[PDB]
């Protein structure tokens, strides 16, 4: 059965795959369905923007993607309490609320708090009866538009720290050599055994 | 060009609906044009033909100047029969020749209150 110099092949076709063949013949059909679903939502539901609730600045958990940034799920109840609004009142304002998201970083805490301040500044609400809570006159001719597209804030915000102009400096360039990484690696590998030998030296007198 | 996606361009489906259409559809199928003076007088393009309409035939074996009154309308065969149009059999018995009503120019309609309402709707829709 095999042949000349070619790669060893093990295809997973021994199972009766001919019954379960899902071929995307309805891919433009689903595209038209989902276009009509988004358009019918934007017509019938509200003058709320498409992708309605606002998403947080969120760092990805990895040693791979944590340099990048992500639109998360919700605004992490401690952050929402620092912003100072009730939970379901925030949900009806348009704030996405997730009760699971914790806060280890004061930097991300204050970043989401400033994002909430920006969203509260950009918020224009419409109550039913004209008793004017938190509104005024015809603001910006009904705010010049009705429905936004793909997030009100464009929630990526890939921050660009530059640090362009600096002078070459003192003995830090002689001190930050390759040997610091190997010394830190050896210290991390031998952190515990040295403590055990120190305990044994203190014990044996 | 056809733009509404709820109507067929299919030859099999069109022939199926045509040769299996019910009688109230076949009345609309068996419609006949009018003479130029009658369409000038009534402001209408064409009318469905009935039992007591006078007919001048424009095409076929019998052509022109033969204004006669129809007698039968077989909507099963899509054929009207005309009293003037005759053909003898072998045994000397006359029989009416099959004429399709689309090759039929009506010179005199039948006056009825229902046909006046139909003609008024035709004129109002033609505008």
């Amino acid at each position: 059965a095999p042949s000349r110099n070619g790669m060893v092949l093990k295809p997973h076709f021994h199972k009766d795959w001919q019954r379960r063949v899902a071929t995307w013949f309805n891919q433009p059909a689903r595209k038209i369905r989902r276009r009509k679903a988004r358009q019918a939502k934007a017509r019938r539901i509200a003058p709320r923007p498409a992708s309605g609730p606002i998403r947080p600045i969120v760092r990805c958990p990895t040693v791979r993607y944590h340099t990048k940034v992500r639109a998360g799920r919700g605004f992490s109840l401690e952050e929402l309490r620092v912003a100072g609004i009730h939970k379901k009142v925030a949900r009806t304002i348009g704030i996405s609320v997730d009760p699971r998201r914790r806060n280890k970083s004061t930097e991300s805490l204050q970043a989401n708090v400033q994002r909430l301040k920006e969203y509260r500044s950009k918020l224009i609400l419409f109550p039913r009866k004209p008793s004017a809570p938190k509104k005024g006159d015809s603001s910006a001719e009904e705010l010049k538009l009705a429905t936004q597209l793909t997030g009100p804030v464009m929630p990526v915000r890939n921050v660009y720290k530059k640090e362009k102009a600096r002078v070459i400096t003192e003995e830090e360039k002689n001190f930050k050599a390759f040997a610091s990484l190997r010394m830190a690696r050896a210290n991390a590998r031998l952190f515990g055994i040295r403590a055990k030998r120190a305990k044994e030296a203190a014990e044996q007198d | 060009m056809k733009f509404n996606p709820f109507v067929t361009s299919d030859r099999s489906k069109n022939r199926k609906r045509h040769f299996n259409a019910p009688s109230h559809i076949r009345r609309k199928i068996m419609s006949s044009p009018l003479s130029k003076e009658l369409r000038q007088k009534y402001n209408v393009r064409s009318m469905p033909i009935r039992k007591d309409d006078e007919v001048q035939v424009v095409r076929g074996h019998y052509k022109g100047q033969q204004i006669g009154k129809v007698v039968q309308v077989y909507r099963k065969k899509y054929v009207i029969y005309i009293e003037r149009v005759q053909r003898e059999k072998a045994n000397g018995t006359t029989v009416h020749v099959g004429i399709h009503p689309s090759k039929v120019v009506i010179t005199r309609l039948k006056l009825d209150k229902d046909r006046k309402k139909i003609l008024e709707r035709k004129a109002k829709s033609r505008q």
Partner: protein, 260 residues
């Protein structure tokens, strides 16, 4: 097929009862009972290679090759010899690619469209399309295609203001947009050089949409014009230039045939 002639349960005879080794449907009374079962060589049998639905139908093209083909078709539409060799009647027609005013795109009635084609002499091509609208050759008349309606001029525009209505029922015409350039409409049948009629905004938007060799395309993101292989490509001028004929051996036109 998807449900073949395997509805018939059948077994083969074997050694005795020596008709064949093909499976045979089993029964009585009915004269089919004993005939050929599923198989390629039998009556009513399963065909060879039942053509399944998961054939590799749709073929992806590189977008650079797509834009390359669009640029090649639009460039070949400018030469008069190519479009006359495709067969459009460009005898009394004025200068190549025709640019009409901005009052054309706001037409409503198609009598103005017919009058415009008669004054721009594309009515000869439209009359050729009228003269050739014959019946389809072959069995393809059954599946709702009974017309050989050959392609004529195509009008390329922007700012649709009723020009699709004015050009909608002209035979052989092609509704085509600047932002959506179709290869299947600009070069039908794999042949280049189709007669096209532009507009002022169209003919000014082409340079914005593709660019020259100096600047990039401003409407597209990362597209440039392709590399031009032979810049001054007049081969007769090159071979009759003095710099080439200075370095030639000699015209050797003797024959030196077979000597008996």
């Amino acid at each position: 097929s998807e449900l073949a002639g395997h509805q018939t349960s059948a077994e083969s005879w074997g050694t005795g009862r020596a008709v064949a080794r093909i499976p045979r449907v089993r029964g009585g009374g009915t004269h089919r009972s004993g005939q050929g079962a599923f198989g390629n060589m039998c009556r009513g049998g399963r065909m060879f290679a039942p053509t399944k639905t998961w054939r590799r139908w749709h073929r992806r093209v590189n977008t650079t090759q797509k834009r390359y083909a669009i640029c090649s078709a639009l460039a070949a539409s400018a030469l008069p010899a190519l479009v006359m060799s495709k067969g459009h009647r460009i005898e009394e027609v004025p200068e190549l690619p025709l640019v009409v005013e901005d009052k054309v795109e706001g037409y409503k009635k198609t009598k103005e469209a017919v009058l415009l084609l008669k004054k721009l002499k594309a009515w000869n091509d439209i009359k050729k399309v009228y003269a050739s609208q014959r019946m389809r050759a072959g069995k393809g008349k059954m599946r709702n295609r009974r017309r050989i309606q050959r392609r004529g001029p195509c009008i390329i525009y922007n700012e649709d203001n009723g020009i699709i209505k004015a050009f909608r029922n002209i035979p052989g015409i092609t509704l085509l947009n600047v932002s959506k350039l179709n290869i299947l409409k600009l070069a039908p049948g794999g042949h280049v050089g189709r007669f096209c009629i532009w507009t002022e905004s169209a003919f000014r938007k082409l340079d914005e949409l593709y660019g020259t060799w100096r600047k990039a395309a401003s409407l597209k993101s990362n597209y440039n014009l392709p590399m031009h292989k032979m810049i001054n490509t007049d081969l007769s001028r090159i071979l009759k230039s003095p710099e080439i004929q200075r370095a030639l051996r000699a015209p050797r036109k003797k024959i030196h045939r077979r000597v008996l």
